[PDB]
């Protein structure tokens, strides 16, 4: 029951739709979206 | 300096893309899986 946060934007699990965990890091759906725009190379 | 994806451990030379945030990195392969997760539920 610990508060977990996205390692990229700092938002908590209670502020995002989804939080994905790596070994010792986390990323939320919003940041995954930003990464998509970058990898897609368009806005 | 050699950088590694914080999520899968692969070096930048093993992936196509590597994006970084504050003391954290993620590659295209992990981003791809994250999309599957988000589009899954």
């Amino acid at each position: 029951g610990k508060l977990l946060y996205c390692s990229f934007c700092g938002k908590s699990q209670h502020e995002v739709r989804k939080l994905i965990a790596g070994p010792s890091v986390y990323i939320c759906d919003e940041c995954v979206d930003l990464c998509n725009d970058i990898i897609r190379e368009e806005i | 300096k050699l950088l590694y994806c914080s999520f899968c451990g692969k070096s930048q030379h093993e992936v196509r893309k590597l994006i970084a945030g504050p003391s954290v990195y993620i590659c295209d392969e992990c981003v791809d899986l994250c999309n599957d997760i988000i589009r899954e539920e």
Partner: peptide, 6 residues
């Protein structure tokens, strides 16, 4: 903020 490493 995000940055492109590669």
């Amino acid at each position: 903020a995000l940055r492109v490493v590669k």
